[PDB]
């Protein structure tokens, strides 16, 4: 007897602390004051007038239940519900060599965002009057692999700066994306410890002069801040975090990351570590395919993009059917019947890896790979609409997401692929030209077969309902305008259209014969 933390372990090199007053604990008061499991005041042996004792912040170990106070560690489930509130977090650190030993200071912080913030080594030092938060002498870890940390000692930066820069850097990243923060970390101990600097915690609060829950806090003048409308805010009111390693991974992080994703090589920089942590969380959760019970609220204008997406789908597959008159259509990646063109003579076959249970009688359970299936559908046309695959067959109509475009919808992923979120987040592979080698790009066009009915405009590109004249026909002239807008919307949404090369704009004209 008895066990000790050590948390707030006294790291000073002083023998013989500490007077029973100005002693934080019974554990340290000099043996001289201790008798019979107690302490006793001896006026003769004085309390120190001046002393500086480094107190270790390591081993924070916080698990607690208080009604008004939110658990800051969350279930794997709850961590999926909020994604890209996700930020990878890892802190390289330093040891205090000179006037103290046995604690680790937070030298360099890094995030899923490319940013790295380096700080002056600082710590908490107990003194006669109070506890003070101050710069401390410190040294780099011993290893030759840690040799890269040395210069960072000098470079920067005051913590009052860093904790303010941290917020803004998180602020403009998460402003539109989420209401909160979740920290994704591999081995959580030191980052929890690092968190002590820029984080204050407490019961939930609403943004000053704003409706949404408060992410940030300001010591300057007490205030509770929104993600968007905060500025000049030092502290983060209610972060969340999840320790990936808690998930039962076998080895070290790098091994597990590199197993799946090759787009991140490793430089020991804290960021490159904090990114790797995210790939794993991403991959482990989201390369499992399309759990459909998860609802992420949307902002913004995905509904428009969603409608536009389907709208343009109908147009192109209807025409492509008209023009080249395919006997059968293989629709791959259609979990539900849902014919895009409801009425067509064509044989319509559905294929899916994860067909929806009800309405699963129509669909063949299949996983498409060009290697195996290049032979297997020779007949008619194949449709992959947002079904991302091994390179596409020569006869096809495909809509694919180009991961390279950034919009608040798509988030980084593994490897080089972006995890796309409109609803029901879909992880999609990195955009690859080689995949389209059998196809050709799809030029914009409009098709309407309808009886015809603010300034009019002439479009060379379309099949107009009437081309005999100019010919601006008030129904089409307006519909063409509205369709093109919904087409330009989804092409700006990052989607790209690819068609079999046989396809020709002309052949739609012969449908205007009589």
């Amino acid at each position: 007897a008895e066990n000790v933390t050590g948390l707030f372990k006294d790291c000073s090199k002083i023998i013989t602390g500490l007077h029973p007053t100005q002693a934080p604990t019974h554990l340290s008061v000099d043996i001289k004051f201790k008798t019979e499991g107690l302490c006793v005041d001896i006026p003769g042996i004085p309390k120190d007038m001046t002393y500086r004792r480094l107190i270790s912040m390591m081993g924070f170990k916080m698990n607690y239940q208080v009604n008004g106070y939110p658990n800051m560690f969350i279930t794997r489930e709850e961590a999926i519900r909020h994604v890209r509130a996700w930020i990878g977090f890892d802190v390289e650190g330093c040891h205090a060599t000179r006037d103290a030993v046995g604690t680790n200071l937070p030298l360099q912080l890094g995030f899923s965002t490319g940013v790295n913030l380096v700080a002056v080594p600082t710590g908490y030092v107990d003194t006669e009057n109070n506890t003070e938060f101050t710069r401390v002498n410190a040294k780099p870890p011993p290893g030759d692999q840690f040799k890269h940390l040395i210069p960072l000692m000098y470079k920067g930066l005051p913590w009052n700066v860093v904790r303010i820069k941290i917020v803004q850097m998180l602020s403009d990243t998460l402003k539109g994306l989420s209401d909160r923060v979740v920290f994704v970390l591999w081995a959580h101990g030191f980052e929890l410890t690092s968190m002590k600097y820029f984080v204050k915690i407490g019961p939930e609060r609403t943004c000053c002069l704003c409706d949404k829950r408060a992410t940030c806090f300001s010591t300057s003048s007490d205030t509770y801040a929104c993600w968007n409308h905060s500025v000049g805010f030092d502290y983060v009111y209610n972060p969340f975090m999840i320790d990936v390693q808690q998930w039962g991974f076998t080895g070290n992080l790098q091994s597990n990351h590199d197993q799946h994703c090759q787009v991140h090589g490793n430089a020991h920089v804290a960021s490159c570590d904090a990114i790797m942590t995210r790939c794993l969380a991403v991959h482990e959760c989201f390369v499992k395919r399309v759990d459909w019970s998860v609802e992420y609220p949307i902002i913004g204008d995905e509904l428009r993009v969603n409608s536009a997406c389907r709208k343009v789908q109908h147009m192109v597959v209807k025409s492509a059917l008209l023009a080249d008159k395919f006997p059968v259509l293989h629709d791959i990646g259609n979990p539900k019947a849902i014919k895009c063109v409801p009425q067509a003579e064509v044989e319509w076959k559905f294929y899916d890896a994860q067909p929806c249970s009800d309405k699963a009688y129509k669909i063949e359970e299949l996983f498409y790979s060009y290697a195996t299936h290049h032979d297997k559908f020779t007949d008619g046309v194949c449709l992959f609409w947002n079904c991302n695959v091994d390179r596409y067959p020569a006869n096809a109509i495909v809509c694919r997401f180009d991961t390279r475009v950034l919009s608040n919808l798509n988030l980084p992923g593994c490897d080089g692929g972006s995890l796309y979120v409109n609803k029901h987040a879909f992880h999609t592979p990195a955009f690859d030209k080689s995949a389209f080698t059998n196809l050709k790009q799809l030029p914009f066009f409009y098709y309407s077969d309808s009886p015809c009915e603010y300034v009019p405009l002439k479009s060379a590109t379309c099949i107009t309902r009437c081309n005999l004249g100019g010919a601006v026909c008030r129904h089409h002239a307006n519909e063409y305008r509205q369709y093109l807008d919904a087409y330009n919307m989804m092409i700006s949404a990052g989607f790209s259209l690819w068609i079999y090369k046989q396809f020709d704009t002309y052949n739609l004209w012969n449908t205007f014969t009589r």
Binding site: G6, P24, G68
Partner: protein, 133 residues
């Protein structure tokens, strides 16, 4: 590598971790008590003559048959969690002086120092009690 001197027992970990991060440490503590969590222990307890003034702040331990005596710093929450003191600049009252608590209320010495204020006239606990007012 520790490589250091351990100042704390595990039984106080969560509470101290909790109040350290909190914006209001004082509330967090009182709240934590309500939740059924244990009051902070390990505070320094004085073997005393128990004859002396009942005064709360004393340069040497002064106790009563009713009171018990504690080293001030160990009874102060802000000293204990190593966070800034509510006095704007910068100083703690209890550190460097011995502090006395009613034995019945002595179970949670840390909170007692938070809840109450000493009367300026006799320099003694208010209500626990005071001839003043």
């Amino acid at each position: 590598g520790s490589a250091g001197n351990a100042t704390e027992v595990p039984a106080n970990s969560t509470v101290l971790s909790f109040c350290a991060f909190a914006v209001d440490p004082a509330k967090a503590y009182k709240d934590y008590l309500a939740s059924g969590g244990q009051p902070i222990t390990n505070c320094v307890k004085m073997l005393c003559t128990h004859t002396g003034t009942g005064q709360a702040i004393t340069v040497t331990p002064e106790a009563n048959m009713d009171q018990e005596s504690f080293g001030g710093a160990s009874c102060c929450l802000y000293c204990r969690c190593h966070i800034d003191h509510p006095n704007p600049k910068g100083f703690c009252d209890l550190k460097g002086k011995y502090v006395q608590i009613p034995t019945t209320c002595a179970n949670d010495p840390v909170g007692f120092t938070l809840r109450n204020t000493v009367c300026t006239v006799c320099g003694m606990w208010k209500g626990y009690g005071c001839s003043c007012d």
